Each structure stands twice: as structure tokens, then as C-alpha cells.
Amino acid sequence: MFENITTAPADPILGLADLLRADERPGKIDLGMGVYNDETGKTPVLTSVKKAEQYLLENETTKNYLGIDGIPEFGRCTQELLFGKGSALINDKRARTAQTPGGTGALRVAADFLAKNTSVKRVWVSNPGWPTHKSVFNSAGLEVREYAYYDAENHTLDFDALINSLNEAQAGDVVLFHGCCHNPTGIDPTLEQWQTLAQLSVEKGWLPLFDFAYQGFARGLEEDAEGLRAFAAMHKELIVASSYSKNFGLYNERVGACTLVAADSETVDRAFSQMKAAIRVNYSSPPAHGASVVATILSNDALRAIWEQELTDMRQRIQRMRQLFVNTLQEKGANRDFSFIIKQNGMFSFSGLTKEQVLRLREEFGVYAVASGRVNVAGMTPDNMAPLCEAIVAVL
Amino acid sequence: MFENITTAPADPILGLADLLRADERPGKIDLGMGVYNDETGKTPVLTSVKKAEQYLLENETTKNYLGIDGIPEFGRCTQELLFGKGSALINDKRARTAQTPGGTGALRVAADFLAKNTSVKRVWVSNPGWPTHKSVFNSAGLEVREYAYYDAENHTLDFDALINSLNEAQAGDVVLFHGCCHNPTGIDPTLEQWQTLAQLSVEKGWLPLFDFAYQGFARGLEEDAEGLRAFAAMHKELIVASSYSKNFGLYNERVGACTLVAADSETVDRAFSQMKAAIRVNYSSPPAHGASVVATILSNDALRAIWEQELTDMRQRIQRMRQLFVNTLQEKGANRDFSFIIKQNGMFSFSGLTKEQVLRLREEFGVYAVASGRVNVAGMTPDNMAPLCEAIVAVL
Ligand SMILES: *Cc1c(COP(=O)(O)O)cnc(C)c1O
Ligand SMILES: *Cc1c(COP(=O)(O)O)cnc(C)c1O
């Protein structure tokens, strides 16, 4: 049965991990996957999380299955975090959230759901974007189209080209927007632009799908949701897939959520049943540990205070590295000006290097980045900055 | 987009939980889902697991993503547990295991894998069987056929009808076998019958797919795999989906595995790449906590000793309840003879009650079982035995 099975192509992102664990060259630099690092170059377990794990270890009395949609508390707090304390969607009870295995699992679920319960036939993703997006919706049987977004020449968001790109989008089509910290450009729409988009969205009859994996890394928790809330204020329906992998550093515990919004509670409940059906034939119930941690923290004033401060420290350290990166390049004899990199927010920065330059960086200097030229700023420490900037200056 | 979405039908098994959490009638008895209970009627966290969680809490330094296939140690130990210490499949390196989110998630993955990388078009499941099996393979686009298995009149395994049932099975077809503790009959093939089936399997060109969710609940860890190992000794290819939800009591942490076997390491590796591709577009990486616990326990002589004793206690308590159940029915004026229930192994017993009798049990006595008449013996305690047997005797 498996005689003629073809070897699968490597994942442009996860595949980097493999090449790293096969390269001896001591002194490598990992700027690939979007995982946070501290001054040490370690991806530590947040303190709030450890204290939360401590709590669960002492108070858990059973591992009995969770309901298909996960921990109820987790969902409520996820909803407050996205829409805001006194959001109408909550008061009107127009939102239903399912705890899912990571932000990727949420997209998988949203995709399976749409494919077989609605008439959606196309999904519009951005270019440049996150490759996995296409792969996930394609595996669900949906076709993927792309819309313009980045101005490679001025290192900014080409709103005109975006609008003209989405004119070809028909009503009933899904449009996927990155909540904040766009991957990989790091360029997000301004509030005024989100408003114009929310307005445009309604008028064209698009189904908004927000992918929220970096809430808290741009400016702040509440600030980073302005875009989403702008849409949420004008739409009857929308889907939000969020992740807690980054802002909680719970990468391997797979904590995410899929939120569904409808006109009224009667509709969202009816639709939510089909989402749960979609989940049951996949993994059945979501993993408890990771989400339990998140709920424990968010519901405990003390623990939440600590967590919010830890998130702030991560956001700030990345900002420091972003500035240290630019300066070091100039100081090291950088060819062009990389000042635009300060404008970008999040863990990534679209360097602008070519596929060959990136290929040469890992081949000759052991510096690993994604072929697209995307580099993980959160992977830069004061210790690797120099060798890192010298190699980049050597391939320019 | 969601205006006309139809309300999904309730799951015959998980749906019971819902009706339970909506019934006030104090004194209810839950004999639905296959979750273990102690004398108290509680589903406690095993001690070995707590000690293991203790260890991780003190030794984990990062939550950084696991590889797509999960924790390497977990896989090795899962393989030893299934095939045996000195198995050839291991020495020859013909097996690859992917840590998955539960035994259900493993089936989902095996299904997605088969659907788009092999020519498999049909899957043969048993009747009676586990309803989710059909739902999972159907969602993957594969068609599901059924083969005879239970002799409702003699409460035994109708081997003749099974063989004649599978004659209609074409080569390249998948046949799903329950490793042990068949759900729901509790009737498993004898070693001689497994051998005859393994032999028949090869000759017809079927692709064996074992679902192993109750390893350790029939007779013992090594004994319960005799069937699987009988097949493994004659096949070049096969798939094993196992769960650790029951024998480790890790239900909500979603710990399972999908093992793939091929003729040689070159083939299994090539095929495994496509399985990993299948996983990446689903949930990306598996949840760490649950599997970390399992690996920690299995790799630690001390902790393993404790665990094996806890598994033995569960197996024995179920056996005691099974005997206490029969006696209490006679003693309470039972109509027919239920001695056949002692022959069944595992958490479930196929009572033989009709859909109406079962419907009346929950309606008038607050006793919950699955419409098929399947009851969770592991849910019976010395305290609920009486009211439980009196209600059953009242609907006979
Ligand atoms: C990290 C990320 C996700 C989701 O990651 P999970 O690990 O599955 O939670 C989704 N979208 C983007 C753009 C991301 O960067
Ligand atoms: C419990 C069970 C499974 C898998 O359960 P998970 O919770 O997904 O690990 C699979 N097959 C049968 C027959 C089962 O009883």
C-alpha cells in the first residue's frame, strides 16, 4: 500500500528546525521560527505559568474528559480579551468559543466547519503571508486567493493595492486578516484603515476571519484588538482564531481558540453545534493542561498582574533588539538603510534579503532565517548581534 | 452566512453527558461514557501521574514547540509497549510513531493520511461497534462498510459470520480491528482466532488497522497485544492507533499515538513524511503535558512499578463489579440469566436491553446508558449497585 508514496516537501518554516539539529557548526544563530528568547537565548517557562502549574498540581482532582468545546471559563475570558469588558457581542450572547489545539488547530476547525456547512468556496489570504494558511484551507477543500499588501520599495503597507486587490472578492467570500503583528511584514493597518476595511467588508458581503496569534506584542492587549473590535462593531458574523502560544509562551501545550459570532444567540448556537460536530471527528476533546493554565492566570488578579508584566517585558526586549539590530548594521558598515525595521512591530521583520542571500547566510555563517527573508527579531541577543550583523553585511 | 445552518444531531455517546448535566433528580447513575471510577464513584488522577506531574513541574525549563511527530521518547516506549521488547519491527526500524491528541486524533490522522496518499476507498468496521469510527473515516472522505461480529443469541463472537462477512472485502481495503476489550461487546478473538485472521488478512490483501484504547484492561499489557503481534508477525504494512486515556487515566490531556509500519525503514520513512504533512495542516504539533507524563512514567522503573499496580487495581475492581452486578440481579429477582456478562472483559458490557428499556431507565430512574444497551461496568460501585439493579429488574 505504501510502496509508491512520495516523500513530502519540507515545510518552509518548521523544516528549518530539522536543518538546525543536523548542523554541527558551533555558533549557529536561529532566526527562523517565531519563538521568543531572553537575553540568554533561552525560551523559558513564564513565572506566572509555573505558579499556575503549581496551583493545578495541588487542586486538580480528576482528568475526566472536557466537553467538546473545552473549558467554559477559558472561553469566557478569551472572549473578554478579544472584544472587551462590556462588549455587546457578549451581552447579546452572539459569540461561542471552542478551546482548540493551538491557533493552527483553530484554523483547521474553522476551515472544516466552513467547507461543509456554508457555501464558502474561496479564502483570501495576504501576500506576503504565512504559508500554513494556504495549506490549511486547501486541505479542507477550499480554494485560496491572495491580495496585495506589502510595498517592497517603501517598506510600508500599500493600502491602494490592497483595496484594488480585494475588489475581485465576491460576496460570500472569506477574507483573512491578521489581528496585529502581521506575519511576516510586521506592518499593520492603522485604526483609520481598519475602519475603512470594516466598512468596505460589510458593503461587499465578505466573511471576516481574524487570525490572532500575537495579541499583546504590538502595543498592548486592548490596543492590539482595535482592528478586530472595529469590524466586530459592524458585522453580524465573523470568525476569530486566536493563539496563546506566544503571549503566554505555551507553544507545546497547544492552547488556542476558535470564536464564532452570529447575528443572535439562536443562530450562533445552531452554527456552533456544527462546529462541535467538526471537532468530534477530529480530536474529540481539547487538551486541558495548557488552557487550564491560561484560565487560572486570567481569573486570578495576582497571577494576571505578573503575567501582564512578563508580556510587557517580552514586548520591550524585542523592541530593544530591533533598535540594536539597526544600529549594529550601520556601525558594522551596512550597505543600505534598515531604519524601516523600527516601524515593524512583533517578533518578525521583513529584512528584504533575497532567497540566495538567505541561503548563503545559513550555508556559510550558520545563520538561519526563512527563505522569504523573514527574521525572528526575538531571537537576537546582545551576544549574537555582532556575528549576526557581520554575516548579513557580508552577503549584502 | 450562518442563517440556514442546521442544528447538528447529538453524539450517541458524548451527548449523554449533556442530558446528565441538565437532570436535577439527585441519585442519578452514569453508566454511559467509558471513564473509570473508584469505590467512591470518582475519576481520580492516578498517583503515578501526580508524581510525574511533580517531576515535570520541577524539571521543565521550556515550552518550546515539539516536533510534528511529538516527543521521541514517547514514541519509542509506545512501540515497545505494543510490539514487545525485542520485536523485529523495532530492530529492523520498520515502525514510525506520531504522538497525537488522543486515540481519536490518531484515527483522524490515519484517516487523512490514507485518504490522500493511498488508493484506499473503503474501511471495514464491526457491528456492533464504536459509532465514532464511522464518523471519522466518513469525514475523511472514505466509505465505511461493516462486518458481522456478535452473536446476540449466545452472547459470543460469531467467527463464522465474521469470516463470511469479510469475504466481500477486496484487496487494498482497510479492516479495523479492536486490539482488545472490543467496544461494546467486550468479546475478543482468541489467540487461535487472531492467528486465523492474521493469516486470512495476508491472503486477501487487506490493510490492518488496529484501534488500541484499552491495552491492559483485559488480561494484561503483554497479553492484550497478542492479537496485534500475531498480525505484526505476518504483515509488511499496518497502522496502529492507540490511546493512553484509559490505562493512564489521562482522558482530558489527549494522549495517543499513530504508529505506521512498512516493509523496510526506507518505505516507512517516506510514508511517515506524508503523515507528518497531514498533521501539520491539522493541529501542527501535539500537546506536550500528557505525553510527557506517560514517557516520564514508562522510563522510570520506580514510577512504572506504581503505575502498573494502579492499572492492575482498576482492572480488578471492574472484574469485581462485573460479578457483583450479576449476583445482585439474580438476588433482586432478575428475569433472565446474565452470567454471560462475566465472559466479557473491559469497562463495557453489552447488556442486551432494548432502546426503549434504556430510554425508560434514564427517564424513570435516572440511570444513563447508551441506547445500544452498552453499560459502563467501571461506573458501578457497591453503593449504586442496588438502586441500579432494581431499576434494571423493573424494565425487564
Ligand atoms: C504562531 C502563528 C499561529 C498559530 O500558532 P499555534 O502554535 O498553532 O498556536 C497562527 N498564525 C500566525 C500568523 C502565527 O504566526
Ligand atoms: C476511548 C476509545 C478510543 C479513543 O479515545 P481517546 O479519548 O480519543 O483517546 C478509541 N476507540 C475506542 C473503541 C475507544 O473506546
Curated annotation (Swiss-Prot), chains A, B:
As stated in the Swiss-Prot or TrEMBL entry, residues carrying the post-translational modification N6-(pyridoxal phosphate)lysine are: K246
Please tell me one Gene Ontology term that the record gives under cellular component. cytoplasm
Q: What are the record keywords, sorted?
A: Aminotransferase, Cytoplasm, Pyridoxal phosphate, Transferase
Please indicate which superkingdom the organism of origin belongs to.
Bacteria
Changing R374 to F/Y does what? Answer: Second-order rate constants are reduced by >5 orders of magnitude
Is Transferase included in the keywords of this UniProt record? yes
Q: What is the applied biotechnology use of this protein, as the UniProt note states?
A: Has been used to construct a 2,4,6-trinitrotoluene (TNT) biosensor strain.
Q: Known CDD domains for this protein? A: AAT_like (cd00609)
> What's a single GO BP term from this record?
L-phenylalanine biosynthetic process
Molecular function terms, GO-annotated: identical protein binding; L-aspartate:2-oxoglutarate aminotransferase activity; L-tyrosine-2-oxoglutarate transaminase activity; protein homodimerization activity; pyridoxal phosphate binding
Which organism is the protein's source? Escherichia coli (strain K12)
- Protein location: Cytoplasm
Q: Which NCBIfam families does the UniProt record give?
A: PRK09257.1
Q: How does it assemble?
A: Homodimer.
Annotated SUPFAM superfamilies:
PLP-dependent transferases
Which InterPro entries has this protein been placed in?
Aminotransferase_I/II_large, Asp_trans, NHTrfase_class1_PyrdxlP-BS, PyrdxlP-dep_Trfase, PyrdxlP-dep_Trfase_major, PyrdxlP-dep_Trfase_small
Q: What is this protein called?
A: Aspartate aminotransferase
Give a single Pfam family match: Aminotran_1_2
User: Family assignment?
Assistant: Belongs to the class-I pyridoxal-phosphate-dependent aminotransferase family.
**Which transformation does this protein catalyse, written as a reaction?**
L-aspartate + 2-oxoglutarate = oxaloacetate + L-glutamate
